[model samples]
Target: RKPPKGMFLSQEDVEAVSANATAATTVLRQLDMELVSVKRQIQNIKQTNSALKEKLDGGIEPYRLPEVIQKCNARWTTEEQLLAVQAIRKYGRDFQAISDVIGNKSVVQVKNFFVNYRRRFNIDEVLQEWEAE
Candidate 1:
């Protein structure tokens, strides 16, 4: 009966070794569950991400355009000059009236043209002809 307690140490050592194996297996199962849950969470996020990507717009906007920015040309034409002269005869140095007849040149431009081209346009003769009437 005194030696039986000494034999119990061998049984205790075997139990301890078996318990270590059980603990190692349980920890490995817990690691497996953790890794699997991590993968599932990423896949869940990808589901919403993929659905949002599918809802994006896909088309081209369109418009018609105009090119009238460079539409100005200041050079006087023969028809316009003739119209001014024609109006000058009727209105006698009335540049405002001449401008209306010409349809484009302002009164200042009409007077400037008269001052510059009096001889060519025979403005003095026209004035004298009007003065007689």
Candidate 2:
């Protein structure tokens, strides 16, 4: 009988190589899809944060000078104090709204407490929930 004309690896070797390539391609495609989905989620989070900030604007309290000075003296970084002031300036006047923004006592409790006291101490104007734009 004549020998086989075509030169090739054994059938099993070819099948194994093909299966490996297919699996690798599938894994890579899955990774690419996951990356895109994560990016979309990050964008959604940023939008939500922006909207919340806008809602806090109308309830802003008057800027307090002495408290600012004390915070500066207490070894708090300028940026940290500045953010606290900004939060107050945006949503300090209203108790209920401020309460909403200060949802977690862990992350924003200090700022929240400061805002409440600062508003009461400064006698800032009251604004409606819709006005918190």
Candidate 3:
């Protein structure tokens, strides 16, 4: 009866099989090391992104003006009022134009600033005077 498959391996066949197994093991080890390196790089990127988010969060705080200019006898700062007025005069209710004038502020922020300024300072009268001139 014929030997079962692989039951009659010659010395050369055994050597070849051993060589292939050793090569596969070596390749797997190298791939594992590469995977570890890639994981470390990903961690580093996450840390950098987290730090950037913190800085951006802190940086955005100054752009957010209060809805009301004054409360309980406390009024908005002169600098804040001046920025709002300057943006309104230059842009005339165009939030995009106001954003450009304010640098780093969004259209929403510019609109809010102008709206608050108008509410506090009666901007319609000023616009009327400008139209007459």
Candidate 4:
């Protein structure tokens, strides 16, 4: 025969290459398992954070303020201002309580909105209206 047609390398070289491939495959498998474990841990943390936020927010989901409020590039809509004023009037400066009714703003965000609003308009007028009610 022609000294085994497909045997281009010595037996030792073939065995060494085969062993290296096996070791690499095993290491890759272990890394995949670790990645899966890490992903599950991340999911758990996210769930825990969401639950804590809801608890702190009094069971209400975190709200997204309107673009106008968020960017401060445009004037507040009449409806948005009305809601803020009403919430403040009803809740009486208790930021958490106001946020619960307002639906998307945090306490700090509500306070900031009021501060900016007061600079532009008469908060006392809104308060008077609320008191009149």
> TM-score for all predictions?
0.44, 0.32, 0.34, 0.36
Listing every candidate in turn, what is its Cα RMSD in Å to the true structure after a full C-alpha superposition? 26.9, 16.7, 13.5, 14.4
lDDT tens per residue, model 1, 59-119: 2224444432432235689988887777887888787777766777777888888887798
The whole-model lDDT of each prediction reads 0.75, 0.54, 0.65, 0.70
Local accuracy of candidate 4 as per-residue lDDT tens digits, 63-125? 655443333223446766678787877766778877666656667777888778786667767
Which prediction has the highest TM-score against the true structure? Answer: 1
Instruction: Compare candidates 2 and 3 on TM-score and give the better one.
Output: 3
* Model 2 alpha-carbon drift over 4 Å, by segment: 1-19, 63-133
**Which digits, one per residue and each the tens of the lDDT, describe model 2 over residues 1-133?**
4437886667775565578658757767888999999999999999999999898886656653332111212333445445444555576544444433443223345544465555543424322332467
Candidate 4 is scored at a TM of: 0.36
Top-lDDT structure, candidate number: 1
Candidates 3 and 4 compared: the better one by lDDT is 4
Clashing pairs in 3: none
Write down the worst ten-residue block by lDDT for model 4: 67-76
Q: Which candidate do you rate higher for TM-score, 1 or 2?
A: 1
Where is model 3 more than 4 Å wrong at Cα?
Answer: 1-77, 130-133
User: Which candidate, 2 or 4, would have the higher lDDT against the true structure?
Assistant: 4
Sorted on TM-score, best first, the list reads: 1, 4, 3, 2
Local accuracy of candidate 3 as per-residue lDDT tens digits, 45-108:
9999999888776676778876533222123456645665665655566778655544546667
